[PDB]
RNA sequence: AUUAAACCUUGUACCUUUUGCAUAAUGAACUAACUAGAAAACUUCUAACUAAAAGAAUUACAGCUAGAAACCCCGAAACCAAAC
């Protein structure tokens, strides 16, 4: 068959049921909330528009964060 | 599609003229297209064969063929080469003769 | 139709009687046996309209002569095909029918031919040109969808500096043209053909024919920044002062 | 509480006094009592057509087919339509009553 | 009192109107109560049976889905075996389908297999009466009953038709070519004919849709 | 086991053919066999010969003493051909 | 599923042959064509 | 060899509800004011309802539609099968 | 038999449940909410004031207008300079 | 053919392949089952409608829409990854 919930939703189900549900709400909120780390090695694009090469028209742009590896140390 | 508006003087400045009234009492009646135009289309097949097709043929198709053959025989110089699709009620003629046929159809009052 | 007399005599048809038309299906070759055994974007894509077609549209009554010619009405009448995917940017006019199109009516076209302008003006028609943003024009052709989205009417855009000279040109009769030159310009066009210029003011419906929207205004009927109560068949106008400042901005 | 009436045959033979029944029907249905050129009278009137056709069908016992219904524009068509006999006899039934020769044997096993 | 019906739309002058006998199901002998007119452009179209043939094939084959599958040698832990679920759905032009439906109506009318009725209401709900009435009027073994809308169809007719396999009760929107051919004779209410005529007649002057009909 | 009914039906005919060949049935008179009408055959018999026969007399000639006994035996649970035979 | 009848068609013409030819379809078929 | 026994007799009813009601509402779009397109009446696998394509297209569409819900074993097998299919059609 | 009731599309606004995980994100966006308003207008219940840009949005919108969309006077200046350069 | 099973008369096994030739050469104890051509971009043909066609995204100076019409099998020496 096929799983009704994708793999990423499997973790959510465990968090919502069992001992995870019994966990303190404050701790659950801390786990649930995600805050983006402050950029260090990458800066956001200065311009918000650029000329699309394919159609030759101005298009919106996106920011790609630089990959950085943080060792366990 | 709105029906054509009544005009004080026919033909219209563009040149369109509605079917003549009263309609002819011939065995075969030719109805106009949805756009109120004569159902005559110039067609070319195989890249070398020019053709003209009449679609909205009603009544006795054989009678129409005889008259069409008679009308086109002098102008063409011989009996026209035609193919009759009775099932679809359409007539196929080799060559481009829409202008003469269109004028001739107006004479009939269609 | 003697064929019908054949039908009445013939017996009732059944499901099995169905038979494919002659030559409808071709044969195929199967491998069962030995038979098969062995072995440019910057330039606006102006879309033209023939005056003979315009006469055809007018003569057939496809577009109401009383109402001034509107590009949206032409779309509603299926006069021309405009595809946003084609990235059509403009609409133009055609000189065809110059000698077989005798009529006078007010019209607005993104682009107009100099020769055609005088001919229609000679009959007494009013011709002007307005600039619609290709994105905005697509909205203009299909107003209902953005109402479904809930978007409000935006202010009409202005041409890029490349196309400003054309619209600003008095002879082009653009909305950016100086009105002061129009009385002089119309005489010059009349002089070119030599026809006696018929003053538009003389016309009883002069105000209706000469009515024009603001450059910011997309629609004659509707001012920019307006909203429509499509569910209630009513028009909603913003009452916020800041919104008026936004429209001014 | 509703009981089906017996099935009726579709076989009709022109009456010997065909005109008598026809004229009597018109004499009653039509107030003018069979006026001049009754044969050429038009049936376009809905009320008259229903009364005349229904009355004739009940009195005569033969009814105009729906496919043939529109053809009954004039009384002449009705008179001609009724005078042609209609037989329900099957082809086998006709063969049985056709002076079967001694050497020919027919048995209906259905 | 004859019930006289005329076509709501303008019939062409060069084409004469079509007519048929109006019937009622209230009584066994209530065969003829009125006269109705039918549009020639709908009920007097040309007999083009290939379109009907084409429509029938589309009807049968557009719902066809094959789920047969087999493992090839590479998939073993068949040289030419079935490969997964396959569907045969396709769409015929809706103008042809409308044209095909028009042809079918003419065939039933010209063949005296179509029976126009004022209403489907029946004095009794007994399925026997419906079969009994069909025999008296020489209807075919299979009879199709059509009503304007499903919600308002009479209970008595539903009970009679529900218990009869060869007599099927369908709404106007459910009408199709296959059922008409499958059923020997067709019974149509007067409102249904007008409803069918409007849609079929509306097919003319078909402005190509610039947006979804919804 | 191959599916289908036509193949099974064909084999049944094959079995019947072998049975008939191996064991031909005992002879039986056409009178017992179906589609026999004594009156019809006699009329055809006379016409085929292009000769006129008196049906009553012809029946007596065909009638035999042995046949009567069989019918009489069944009856227990008519003119012989001797006179015509002598002539 | 009727391959047996195809064999019978060859067999009826090859019943009078001698040796394994009369009973082998591979050989029986060839002989019948040559005989014809 | 061939059967020596008769198959069970079978009689099929052509007027059963399924056959009798087959095809009803096939004209829903034209007869329903086009509120419901006939494609909406298609019942089958989600990735091919109202859509048709070749075997490669059908498999690819299946992967996208239920890739998140597909088994790892099935997903791995599908990728391997797709690779073979891709090479054959696009190079031979 | 009697045919089943015809299938019918459910009319009227339908509000997805935000908490449900299964509901797609795009169905919970303000654009979806704006779409609901257009379909049913007042029946949707969307506040009309929310449809117009928020004051923070208003400030953002003006930024692009100045940044990307010059006014007529600015072009008129550019034309004069370009004409002078061409001259 | 024959009255007659054999005699008399006529006739250089088969598949593939070589030259369109084998008295070459391959392959076959025999029986049963299994065992190898698959795709629509365009064209012709079949129809719908037509300066328009298509149930949204396509093409159009008779086109446009739908249908139908097509391209095998078995078999290496190898190469690489991960185990044993």
Curated annotation (Swiss-Prot), chain C:
One Pfam match: Ribosomal_L27A
Organelle targeting peptide span: 1-12
Keywords for the protein's UniProt record, in alphabetical order: Mitochondrion, Ribonucleoprotein, Ribosomal protein, Transit peptide
Alphabetized InterPro entries for the sequence: Ribosomal_uL15, Ribosomal_uL15/eL18, Ribosomal_uL15/eL18_sf, Ribosomal_uL15_bac-type
GO BP, sorted A to Z: cellular response to leukemia inhibitory factor; mitochondrial genome maintenance; mitochondrial translation; translation
Top-level taxon: Eukaryota
GO cellular component terms listed in the entry, alphabetical order: mitochondrial inner membrane; mitochondrial large ribosomal subunit; mitochondrion
Comp. bias intervals (Basic residues): 24-39
The UniProt record lists the keyword Cytoplasm: no
Compartment(s) of residence: Mitochondrion
Principal localisation: mitochondrion
Keyword check for Transit peptide: yes
GO molecular function, one term: structural constituent of ribosome
Similarity remark: Belongs to the universal ribosomal protein uL15 family.
Quaternary context: Component of the mitochondrial ribosome large subunit (39S) which comprises a 16S rRNA and about 50 distinct proteins.
Protein name according to UniProt: Large ribosomal subunit protein uL15m
Organism whose genome encodes this protein: Mus musculus
Taxonomic lineage from the root: Eukaryota, Metazoa, Chordata, Craniata, Vertebrata
UniProt gene name: Mrpl15
UniProtKB/Swiss-Prot annotation, chain D:
GO cellular component entries: cytosol; mitochondrial inner membrane; mitochondrial large ribosomal subunit; mitochondrion
Keywords: Mitochondrion, Ribonucleoprotein, Ribosomal protein
Localisation per UniProt entry: Mitochondrion
GO biological process: mitochondrial translation
Ranges annotated as spanning the membrane: none
Superkingdom to which the source organism belongs: Eukaryota
The protein's assembly and partners: Component of the mitochondrial ribosome large subunit (39S) which comprises a 16S rRNA and about 50 distinct proteins.
Family according to the record: Belongs to the mitochondrion-specific ribosomal protein mL50 family.
Identification of the protein by name: Large ribosomal subunit protein mL50
Organism the protein comes from: Mus musculus
Lineage, top ranks: Eukaryota, Metazoa, Chordata, Craniata, Vertebrata
Range of the intact protein held here: 50 to 159 of 159
UniProtKB/Swiss-Prot annotation, chain H:
GO molecular function: structural constituent of ribosome
Compartments where located: Mitochondrion
Domain of life (superkingdom): Eukaryota
Primary residence: mitochondrion
Nucleotidyltransferase among keywords: no
Coiled-coil positions: none
Keyword Cytoplasm: no
Cellular component, GO, one term: mitochondrion
Keyword terms: Mitochondrion, Ribonucleoprotein, Ribosomal protein, Transit peptide
GO BP field: mitochondrial translation; translation
Disulfide bonds: none
Family membership noted in the UniProt record: Belongs to the mitochondrion-specific ribosomal protein mL51 family.
Subunit organization: Component of the mitochondrial ribosome large subunit (39S) which comprises a 16S rRNA and about 50 distinct proteins. Interacts with OXA1L.
Listed name of the protein: Large ribosomal subunit protein mL51
Species name: Mus musculus (Mouse)
From-to range in the entire protein, with total length: 33 to 124 of 128
UniProtKB/Swiss-Prot annotation, chain I:
Segments of this protein annotated with the region Disordered: 1-23
Entry keyword Coiled coil: yes
Protein localization: Mitochondrion; Nucleus
GO cellular component, one term: mitochondrial large ribosomal subunit
Gene Ontology BP terms: mitochondrial translation
Family as reported in the entry's similarity comment: Belongs to the mitochondrion-specific ribosomal protein mL64 family.
Function: Acts as a negative regulator of G1 to S cell cycle phase progression by inhibiting cyclin-dependent kinases. Inhibitory effects are additive with GADD45 proteins but also occur in the absence of GADD45 proteins. Acts as a repressor of the orphan nuclear receptor NR4A1 by inhibiting AB domain-mediated transcriptional activity. May be involved in the hormone-mediated regulation of NR4A1 transcriptional activity. May play a role in mitochondrial protein synthesis.
Protein name (record): Large ribosomal subunit protein mL64
Organism encoding this protein: Mus musculus (Mouse)
Gene from which the chain derives: Gadd45gip1
Shown part of the complete sequence: 25 to 111 of 222
